[PDB]
Amino acid sequence: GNHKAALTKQVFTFASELYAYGVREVVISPGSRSTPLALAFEAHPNIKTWIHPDERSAAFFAVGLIKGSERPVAILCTSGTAAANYTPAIAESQISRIPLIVLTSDRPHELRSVGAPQAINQVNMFNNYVSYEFDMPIADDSKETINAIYYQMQIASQYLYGPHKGPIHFNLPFRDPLTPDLNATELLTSEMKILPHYQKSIDASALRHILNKKKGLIIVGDMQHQEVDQILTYSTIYDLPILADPLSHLRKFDHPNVICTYDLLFRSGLDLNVDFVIRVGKPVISKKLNQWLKKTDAFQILVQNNDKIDVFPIAPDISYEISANDFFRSLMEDTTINRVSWLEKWQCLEKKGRKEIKCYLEQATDESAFVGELIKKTSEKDALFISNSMPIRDVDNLLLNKNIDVYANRGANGIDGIVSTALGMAVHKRITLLIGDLSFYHDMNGLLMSKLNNIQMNIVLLNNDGGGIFSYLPQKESATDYFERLFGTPTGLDFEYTAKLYQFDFKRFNSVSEFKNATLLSETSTIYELITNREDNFKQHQILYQKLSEMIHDTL
Amino acid sequence: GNHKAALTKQVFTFASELYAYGVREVVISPGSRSTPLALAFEAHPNIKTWIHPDERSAAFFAVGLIKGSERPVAILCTSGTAAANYTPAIAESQISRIPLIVLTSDRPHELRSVGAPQAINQVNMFNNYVSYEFDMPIADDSKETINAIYYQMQIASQYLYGPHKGPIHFNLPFRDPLTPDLNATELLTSEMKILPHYQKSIDASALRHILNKKKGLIIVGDMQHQEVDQILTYSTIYDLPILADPLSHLRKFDHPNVICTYDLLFRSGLDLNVDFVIRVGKPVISKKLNQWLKKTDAFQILVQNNDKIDVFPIAPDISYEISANDFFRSLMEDTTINRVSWLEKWQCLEKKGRKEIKCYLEQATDESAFVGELIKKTSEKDALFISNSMPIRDVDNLLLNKNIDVYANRGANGIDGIVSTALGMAVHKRITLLIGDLSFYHDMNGLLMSKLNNIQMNIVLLNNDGGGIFSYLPQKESATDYFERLFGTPTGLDFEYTAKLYQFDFKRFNSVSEFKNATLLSETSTIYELITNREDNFKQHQILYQKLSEMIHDT
Amino acid sequence: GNHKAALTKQVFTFASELYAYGVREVVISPGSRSTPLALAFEAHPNIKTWIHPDERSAAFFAVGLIKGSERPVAILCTSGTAAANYTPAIAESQISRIPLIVLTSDRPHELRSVGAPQAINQVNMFNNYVSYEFDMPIADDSKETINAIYYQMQIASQYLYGPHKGPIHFNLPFRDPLTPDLNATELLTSEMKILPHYQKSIDASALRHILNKKKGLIIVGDMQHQEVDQILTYSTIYDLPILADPLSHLRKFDHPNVICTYDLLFRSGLDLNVDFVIRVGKPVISKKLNQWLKKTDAFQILVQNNDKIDVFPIAPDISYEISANDFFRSLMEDTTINRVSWLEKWQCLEKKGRKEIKCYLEQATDESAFVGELIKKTSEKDALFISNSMPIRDVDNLLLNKNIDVYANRGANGIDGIVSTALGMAVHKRITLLIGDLSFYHDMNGLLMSKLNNIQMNIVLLNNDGGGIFSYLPQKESATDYFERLFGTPTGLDFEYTAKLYQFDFKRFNSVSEFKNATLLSETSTIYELITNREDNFKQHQILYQKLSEMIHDTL
Ligand SMILES: Cc1ncc(C[n+]2csc(CCOP(=O)(O)OP(=O)(O)O)c2C)c(N)n1
Ligand SMILES: Cc1ncc(C[n+]2csc(CCOP(=O)(O)OP(=O)(O)O)c2C)c(N)n1
Ligand SMILES: Cc1ncc(C[n+]2csc(CCOP(=O)(O)OP(=O)(O)O)c2C)c(N)n1
Ligand SMILES: [Ca+2]
Ligand SMILES: [Ca+2]
Ligand SMILES: [Ca+2]
Ligand SMILES: [Cl-]
Ligand code: NA
Ligand code: NA
Ligand code: NA
């Protein structure tokens, strides 16, 4: 069997070469044309498989496995609309730099024709998002077509780790008959390639005249899956305040120089002249702080550990493509700069601000109170996955010194795929998901992975019956007559039926009090639905956004 | 063994199928990777080859071969930047709807990699301009890789004829070794395909209220390689004036209803009220007429025999995708109205305007005087290829009732590849090329085909040492300190040396008096360089542009 | 009016910010729609313009200015097929990593429509080649239209200098009226931005198990515009032979470990067993050495100082993105071993090989002898620009220890734009061009830059009236009847007329004896045409390709 041999050799060598570069699990979607490679993944004894019927949720689930395992994961689907369902997670992968390996199976080269049944053009179909894309040769007996696997995987490997990391696309034409020879297990190897690892440094001589000024600020944004330890060391030696995003992983250390309440301080009118700012990582969540960067005259230095850097919210004076740890290690040099006065001011504001939050949280009965209680209930060394919209903004204002991790899909900021991404992380981590009802409806299909494979994850569902974030927009007042139809968008759905469909336990609370004396338990994966009111949430959030306004004028 | 026989079969079949759908000649550029299909065309007894070392001029030479033969023509190049040089003529073919078949050879799929030596991405590299692009499978002995030719040639044929006409692209990977079995001549077939022929008609009931209004106008723009006879029939029966562009192929008939001086008329301040206009073809050359279309309140009907209709310069009231003949034929079987005084008003403007042009052409000493003489010197039933920039504007104003044809690359309006396109038509037609010096410089490499292949074609070279069209720009006054350097851009080239290099005879005229008593009949192809001055040309053109202002006010 | 001020503020700020990021030259092509930006470049007192009517040659001319100045250069053209003529130089810039800045002028959105007169789609029209593309907004009075220039310029700057270097695209729509206010000279500023610099390092310990083996080779390909000195330092300490390409810039040092005759050695039948190879830079010219790399089972390391690494001709076992100097200074932490015998075998072969080459050049009378004599004549510390096809193969075989630099277009290996690229380099460096007749005809229009602006550059034209390189192909014997028509392609042109047209001096040599006893350097730029015969060249080259056979007796 000349064809069966070549197809088996190609498909089994490809799966092993994916293993050789770090792939340990794949998410497969059912289909006919994907048969040869699907069987290779299942037969390979060191590649775990996950079968997912929904291609959209499957790709977001794989994004979750990548964020949880810190390894590249591959997805495999058949030809046609299946591949088109990958685009949302591929788009989030592009911005968030997720090493997602997209494999689309195709008809053989001689049979392809755009416009035929189930025949879209798949070659370079993700060109808008990926940095690597290749159309595999058809399998034959020659040595050159096998070496293409080694040749192309070596090129592709530069996009799976380091700063060039991002989604890649292999298009794989397969000729009938499709089923390979399952006896050739000798071609299912488990070798391990040596991966290149670098270390960077910069000469900061021309920068010491800035860094030696007194009123300096370190601003750390999204830093999931990066190391941040040397940021704390530089801050301790040089007395520099750190404004730390929730996704910076820096608030859990309880560092005496970490400022967590900056979004409330700036919202309430904090206005200080600062000499320089060191923006590290992806942008922060705080709308008000990002707007302050577009107004300050401070010297701006941006530090980001990826290629294709974007300088949101404003072009800095210099942009460094380097890891935060390597950057701050180049900056350590004995100097006699006293800025204790500058640091003691920020340490003092943060003290009073942390106190005012605790006073608001004692009298709060709104959605923000529910979020504060979940923060209190989360065990140390555990993790929260926070959905987009308001949950991630409440975490910013409310997470202070708890030793926990928070994760999010803060790349494209979509409300899609949150369930699937959280579940993928729960495969490897102890995580609890916090989500609004619109995102929960968006990726309801994602719960199938919990039902079929018993992935342990509780879900804290905030149900204010629509889009709450829009209450804080000007259209609530300038388009009152159309607000609830265009922006409210209530579903009115009974999510207790969702729990029974996907075999979650269900509990509903109508006040923070019942939530306070309850206990989240890992006996089974359960959905806790907390009922809030969007109008009530807006009123109470307004109270919170101006709580610090008195201390600012008082400290002045 | 099998490889040579599989490669021969695929490549000889592909060449034979191209013949079956209309291809009779190809323009090959040298290279190694293009070996198998290059030898196929040369071996095929009914496919003529042209070998051109400059891929840019080669693609424009193919465009000319298409325009002169009215049959699709293929170009073949090797992998790499050879394919990238095709892009200018591919972009011109997208707008002008030229059925140019673009064949790029590639390395085999298993060896492909963007960034390797001589390795750009050729798959869908012309996606920005073509309506059909295919990456062929590597040659096999199986029937399905051979049937892919029959399958994709049938799909690609819809872009070679009719309204979907335009450029198409095949990327052909070839595996080493690349030489085919030249003795397998049985696979070099010469079948001829039967092809669909349609006729269209529209329901004109909801257009009769417009068409029965008196003050109507038929505006015919670019109609190259299209049939226009029923336009004259409808105009005769219904007393409608025809504002005929030079490229409409209508001015040569000396029809009593064809107005040739509309551009000067509208330049001189014509401001008649019009009930409706029927715009047929691609946009006209006249900037002033296209501005008037953005101002008139007339009912606008657009008629174009091609898909992807663009509606320059303004969206009409209705757009019909139909040939001109099939459009006017569907309106002919109707009753008639009396609009004779409207037709005669226009006929009187044309008679006096033509009399004023004859007067101007006796005094003038500028570039437009040279152009008018060439029209007079052109033998009847012969053709002219007009460059872009000023020459196409001067033909618009000066070509009246002469029985000649005029062609031009009026899609992208590029100054590139003019020489090669003109020579391409010259293989099939009696053609004289009129061209400015900068465009002559641009495609000087295109002259190689005249030397190597003995293409009889004379060249009238209008040399004013720079870009004369920019004299009529507001920058000539508003940016005078920088004008000559930025817009003038003289070369100072002695084009007699170009004539010697490419084995052209040469003659240089400094005045229109010498050119008038000269003769363009030549034993060998020859280059006539006519020396003019850009400022002198600007000043005399402004008199020409305003000449009809007094006669217009006397109507 | 208001439009004239907003337009002026846009183009004057755009041109200044280009200067701020390093642009000093711009090559403008005439057109109407380009008027605003064209006058801005002319009016700017510290940007020099070149005016070129042929966009194809113009873009290759800019490539040469980038190579000569080692700065980014911008090109500007009007709408339509003018931009399409840029494609070949952009393709070469993609592979060779040339920071070519492509500026295409476009109609405003109200007149943007594919199919309209002179209206091709220009936005992302270079998606196939460039690393950055942007469609500028139409100028208006808002500050954000200006701020987009500062924002986008910082992003685009990362593609102009480092390992991410490559062609970038700006499409700029301009609305009538087009003339800017030339009295607003205050907006044409000459600030200079600070640009980041890094130093990388790898952990040599991961390669330890390989680099302690004795039969190791360093193979250095195209390294032009790169630092190369630490390769010599590393090879000296560790006794490693260096096979050096002409474009490696390493042959001009007479380093005891540099091998320049490897190609002839392989052609002459050299067989060798290698423990490891370290491939540095872009691929080597030698077909034999690249074919050998596909057959050896040595451990292979690839090191390139650019992103988007391709691994031609075979997949290495590991590949590093790092400069050669940073890589080898990292390998300098290892202790040495004993491979002195291995080095001696290579040093002895190179000694006899150089004597055999010198012997050949005394006897040869073909195209080869002309090239060998041109190298001898060239002044030291001057430079050659070598065309593709045979001249670059002959320089590989004949260039030994002459103290000169060699440059070429070795990305896409096209025969287009060679003349213009050398001329661009001659503006910043002392260079003589060596080019075959078919490539000379291909870029004949590029000589306009020499007539108009009086660039000093001699041209050595190897005229054999056809494609000489195809003599060495299997087609010469397999399809001999069609060879002259399809591969020879004689033009029969008398290039004395080309010299008169572009105001060059002309001298024609029919014998190597005439050429050896002549003087080339002169006050005026000269075209030296050396008539040779393709058939005799093939035969004499056969003797050269076997001139080193009597030195090879045993496998290395
Ligand atoms: C895929 C996608 N569609 C739409 C949006 C726009 N969007 C942002 S927030 C939001 C509503 C989120 O509602 P919910 O999850 O209930 O949270 P809440 O606003 O109540 O906190 C929408 C539709 C988006 N970000 N992503
Ligand atoms: C490829 C290309 N580049 C630029 C232009 C812009 N352009 C239009 S007309 C013109 C000048 C051409 O001058 P020439 O052919 O000498 O004729 P003249 O204006 O003197 O009549 C130019 C550069 C173009 N049309 N095509
Ligand atoms: C743009 C382009 N077209 C075609 C080729 C294919 N090609 C490579 S070398 C060559 C011949 C070059 O001839 P010439 O400059 O006279 O050099 P010779 O072979 O005689 O040394 C050709 C056509 C190419 N590399 N690039
Ligand atoms: Ca909600
Ligand atoms: Ca001119
Ligand atoms: Ca030659
Ligand atoms: Cl030497
Ligand atoms: Na498995
Ligand atoms: Na033939
Ligand atoms: Na200037």
Numbering used by the authors:
A (entry chain C), C (entry chain B): 2 to 557
B (entry chain A): 2 to 556
The authors write:
MenD is a thiamine diphosphate (ThDP)-dependent enzyme that catalyses the conversion of oxoglutarate and isochorismate to 2-succinyl-5-enolpyruvyl-6-hydroxy-3-cyclohexene-1-carboxylic acid (SEPHCHC). Catalysis occurs through two covalent ThDP intermediates as the substrates oxoglutarate and isochorismate are successively added to ThDP before SEPHCHC is released. Sau is an important human pathogen, and uses MK (predominantly MK-8) for both aerobic and anaerobic respiration. In this work, we report that the Sau-MenD is allosterically inhibited by DHNA.
The Sau-MenDIS1 tetramer structure is typical of all known MenD structures to date and, like the Bs-MenD and Ec-MenD structures, is symmetrical, with nearly identical conformations for each monomer (r.m.s.d. using SSM of 0.29–0.44 Å over the length of the chain), and well-defined ThDP and Ca2+ cofactors bound to all four active sites. The three-domain α/β monomeric fold is typical of enzymes from the decarboxylase superfamily of ThDP-dependent enzymes, with domain I (PYR domain, residues 1–200) pairing with domain III (PP domain, residues 364–557) from the other monomer in the dimer to form each of the four paired MenD active sites. The ThDP aminopyrimidine ring inserts into a pocket between domain I and domain III, forming hydrogen bonds with Asn414, Ile416 and Glu56—the latter playing an important role in proton transfer and stabilization of the various catalytically important aminopyrimidine ring tautomers. There is limited conservation of the allosteric region; we identified only one of three key arginines of the Mtb-MenD arginine cage (Arg97) conserved in Sau-MenD (Arg98), with the other two (Mtb-MenD Arg277 and Arg303) being conservatively replaced by Lys283 and Lys309, respectively. Therefore, structural comparisons of the Sau-MenD structure and DHNA-bound Mtb-MenD were used to gain insight into the structural conservation at the putative allosteric site.
